[PDB]
Design a protein around this ligand. Structure first.
Ligand SMILES: [Cl-]
Ligand SMILES: [Cl-]
Ligand SMILES: [Cl-]
Ligand SMILES: [Cl-]
Ligand SMILES: [Cu+2]
Ligand SMILES: [Cu+2]
Ligand code: NA
Ligand code: NA
Ligand code: NA
Ligand code: NA
Lengths: 620, 620
């Protein structure tokens, strides 16, 4: 009965019926996005109204639509025809993944390019690549995908091992026209295979790994109620799933004594982009909003027990829409489990003779997704001591190219003739904060060094300073690792026993942000990425730092536009947008399949509690 | 038979005999440090010569001694009388921990101070605190400890809850004179207790934690041979233990195909200091070299199975000397085990239809120690993919003071009237590098942003640059998080299959370094701490970045002095000294006992291997 429950197959079918009956779902229509809408604010006393938000595509060439419907009242709440040159194109469809290769398969330019390289068209894979926005005037208002080719030698060959450099094509997937084919010249196609399951490459597999058994004889310490509501070691939350963002956390709160204390209203990865830094015209247009353009949630994997999730695992199976509004289940797409996490607290005292040791543990909510060559794990952790943490795990196969004779300042060689262009993976965590409720503010905290002198005669003193961010036009902050810069979210109206506003402190990894020249297309389209921290005033229609329609959108949209409203953020319903990412110069070790690398952030309680919240934890 | 084996009780007793027979170990003598010496370089074909290094104290007031002996040949190799005003005083003795409180127990100044506060002397604990070097001219050449007082209400009371502010005393532990007693005035002594085992404070303990069982039915995947030699998943190392540094790693190498490939010759935490930033005269002299002054290894705890080390655990029990050269065993002072570490690599390919997932794991070598209020865990991790990682875990009880009426810019309030002065914990990792052997160099690598223009028309290109550090006078580097700064250790004479020097890349957390004013005493005594990275030329007598005798030493010694030699580090036997630490502004959550916080660093292979070194890992 919780408004925050996961979408049911039944609900998805109702949406399809509603649209179909309203005439909005003819045979040429396609569902590119379907997601349930969160309950609105001002409903501290309201009745069930489940609404869903739909983006509908037309394959015949008609204008696409944005539509909101109520699945409790079977009504179209809103239906609007979009102008895509203006507000952007709809997310890429999985059904379009095969299209580029097929269109080029009958184009003479393409075939001429393939023949010159002596490549059999039936062996040539073409990645379905988001096109972004550059100089091609005929592209405005058209649904374009760009194509880069990789030879697959046999049905189970890793095509990534065999990039075709010096060649790219653009295609209009609607009109089914190949608009441009560009051959800058021939590069040898790297020859080695990258088949990480070939005994010829793996070699004799190891027999040295003895098993590690992790079990819970009394079951797990967390309970799940009403499908997705979690209670665990004082924590309370709802686990959501959206096809764009993937796993989303709702109503994170902590049970302190006899109060249920809210901390974060909604946590999600609201965007993730992969900009490439290779100035070759074959790739310099590459920037993949894996979240905004492709929708990470639709491609979450079914996690295999013992393989993908070890221990006592509890699965949720989130239901999504297909392109035709049928409900599809992602069997075991979400793992939920608790794991030991080493020592929590420990002291042996030289005076009391007391020896004290307590173990830590964390609740994990995770899922893993695939977007082309990439595979990402998205993990949320709740710790006994009140800490909240996110962690992304980056693996899969590196996006490949030729390695240029003479080397490169922008590409790494992984194997003979084989290159990997430099890129970043930059995430945006959207945190709808609710520290003891919605009245929150953000302060930027820096370490303050003090000069030796009067009142600091020995020159040992150091301090800190906090700066309240009061309006959106001054809540665009950058990192400063050198001065230990963090950001504190507090409630100015809720004090702890020492009469201090309760707060939580954000600790960022301080990784480099978007490296692109500010004048670049990507800088404008991914402006969120150019700064570590943004704070906005909450609003119903400000969901992604890149706006609702990322694909082939002009730029400026999203965060840069919202903060133009310059709204009061000093003791209000606010949202923190945290930029964090990996700058990836590929190594030989990354090839032929890459070991997990990680990035993330965490928040620790800062005067939230009146003392350590883990004194009541028993001693094993 | 390995030269790198742990010291045996038998060996310790021989050292004592040798010294005793040589006349160096009379009843007034004390052993303040005892440690075995590593085999020297140039012994690619030498015979067993076990030597030990001793620091001997005299309680009658005679000059202390440094002595080196051979336990295989029962000879004094060297014995030297130290001038402590010049080269520093010997490490604090555990037997001196009780001394300050006792000396003050009969001093009229002290008693007057206690009586004014109405504190029963028999309830007044006095921390035995390292004194450092300030303005007190009569202190040069004397063995001084400073005292700060904490009331213990009953045998099992946490005295930390009850600091006596506005009062400090200095004592000469040798002459047993109280040199100065300083009362800046009375502060109320905070009243609440901090007894984290009192049901009155803990409240009803939790019953919600279900058990988590971690077992290995076929035993562990690592073997231990000759006491301390570890082989695990291609890795080879020797696990050492020194009473100063604690757990030390020797001969880290990786078995690649049919070669044993060295990576690091010796890894240790060579120093750790805790500077306080409270300008009160009562504490402004506080800087505790937990490693250099107190010796962390002597206070390692015996780790309790199921409590301190979970899973299939293999213990080493390192033997140390007591103050009288008797061998004492630290039962189970070192845990060695392997743990699961989530996903190692994963890809589901849209073209081959292959789905691939492999699990990760790490070998842990750890120990946990107590120094007064502090308790630290020191963890070394070796990962399947070649990654080497260190992690310090900081817990225990915060060092306390009064909280000043009117607040403080340098102290946090944890409870009514109770303060916690701001401080840092700053570590120095000494890494005697051996990348494919001893011919190594270090490059500093930064991200390079490129300006939009000719040859970068779209403004998407970004690159990097590496700068070889050639001489010691230019190998003192600072962090630059903003430009993703890392440091690469490579062997210029050993290339990978792509003809690139094999390397390992150091990734630092980029935490703030020493915040003290450069003109401070601590800045000079802890100069290593003022910069993130130092590279030196290897030498036999350059062990600690702070020199051999930290206690009451003048300053300048250690790293700043070694790099003055300005030696060739470009393709030579080199050592990286990495500074890393926590800047700790204590929170309410830290009280009455603090949850673990962490800091560390890691190194990842960078073109070391010709491809991913984990293709041969089997698929669960
Ligand atoms: Cl998981
Ligand atoms: Cl990648
Ligand atoms: Cl451990
Ligand atoms: Cl502390
Ligand atoms: Cu990458
Ligand atoms: Cu601390
Ligand atoms: Na536009
Ligand atoms: Na909010
Ligand atoms: Na001196
Ligand atoms: Na070396």
């Amino acid at each position: 009965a919780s408004p925050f429950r996961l979408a049911s197959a039944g609900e998805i079918s109702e949406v399809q019926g509603i649209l179909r009956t309203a005439g909005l779902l003819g045979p040429e229509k396609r569902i590119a996005y379907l997601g349930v809408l969160d309950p609105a604010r001002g409903a501290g006393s309201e009745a069930e109204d489940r609404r869903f938000r739909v983006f509908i595509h037309d394959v015949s060439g008609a204008r696409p639509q944005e539509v909101t419907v109520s699945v409790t009242n079977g009504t179209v709440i809103s239906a609007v025809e979009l102008d895509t040159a203006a507000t952007g194109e709809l997310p890429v469809l999985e059904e379009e993944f095969e299209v580029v290769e097929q269109l080029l398969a009958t184009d003479e330019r393409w075939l001429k390019a393939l023949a010159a390289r002596n490549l059999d068209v039936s062996k040539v894979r073409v990645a379905p690549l988001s096109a972004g926005v550059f100089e091609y005037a005929e592209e405005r208002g058209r649904r374009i995908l760009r194509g880069l080719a990789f030879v697959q030698d046999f049905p189970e060959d890793s095509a990534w091992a065999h990039p075709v450099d010096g060649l790219v094509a653009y295609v209009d997937v609607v009109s089914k026209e190949v608009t441009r084919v560009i051959d800058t010249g021939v590069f040898p196609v790297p020859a080695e295979h990258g088949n990480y399951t070939d005994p010829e490459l793996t070699g004799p597999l190891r027999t040295t790994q003895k098993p590690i058994s992790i079990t819970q004889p009394e079951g797990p310490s967390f309970t799940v109620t009403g499908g997705n509501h979690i209670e665990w070691e004082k924590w309370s939350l709802d686990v959501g799933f959206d096809v764009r963002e993937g796993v989303v956390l709702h109503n994170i709160a902590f049970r302190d004594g006899d109060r249920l204390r809210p901390i974060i209203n909604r946590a999600s990865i609201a965007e993730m982009v992969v900009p490439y830094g290779d100035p070759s015209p074959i790739r310099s247009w590459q920037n993949y909003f894996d979240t905004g353009e492709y929708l990470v949630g639709q491609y979450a994997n079914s996690l295999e027990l013992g393989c993908d999730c070890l221990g006592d695992i509890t699965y949720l199976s989130p239901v999504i829409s297909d392109a035709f509004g049928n409900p599809r289940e992602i069997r075991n797409g979400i793992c939920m489990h608790e794991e030991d996490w080493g020592i929590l607290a420990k002291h042996s005292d030289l005076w009391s003779g007391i020896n004290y040791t307590r173990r830590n543990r964390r609740m994990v909510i995770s899922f893993f997704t695939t977007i082309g060559n990439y595979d990402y794990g998205f993990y949320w952790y709740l710790y006994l001591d009140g800490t909240i943490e996110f962690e992304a795990k980056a693996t899969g196969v590196v996006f490949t190219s030729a390695f240029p004779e003479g080397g490169s300042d922008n590409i790494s060689q992984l194997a003979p003739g084989l290159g990997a262009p430099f890129h970043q993976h930059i995430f945006s965590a959207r945190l709808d904060m609710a520290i003891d409720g919605f009245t929150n503010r953000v302060e930027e905290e820096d370490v303050v060094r003090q000069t030796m002198g009067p009142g600091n005669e020995r020159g040992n003193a150091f301090s800190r300073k906090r700066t309240v961010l009061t309006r959106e036009s001054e809540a665009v902050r950058e990192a400063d690792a050198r001065t230990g810069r963090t950001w504190i979210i507090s409630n100015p109206e809720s004090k702890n026993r020492l009469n201090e506003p309760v707060g939580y402190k954000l600790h960022a990894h301080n990784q480099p942000t978007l490296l692109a020249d500010p004048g670049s297309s990507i800088a404008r389209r991914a402006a969120f990425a150019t700064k570590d921290l943004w704070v906005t005033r909450y609003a119903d229609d400000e969901r992604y730092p890149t706006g609702d329609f990322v694909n082939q959108h002009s730029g400026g949209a999203g965060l840069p536009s919202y903060i133009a409203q310059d709204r009061d953020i000093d003791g209000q319903d606010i949202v923190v947008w945290h930029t964090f990412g990996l700058t990836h110069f590929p190594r030989v070790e990354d090839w032929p399949i890459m070991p997990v690398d990680t990035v993330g952030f965490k928040l620790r309680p800062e005067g939230f509690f009146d003392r350590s919240p883990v004194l009541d934890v028993p001693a094993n």
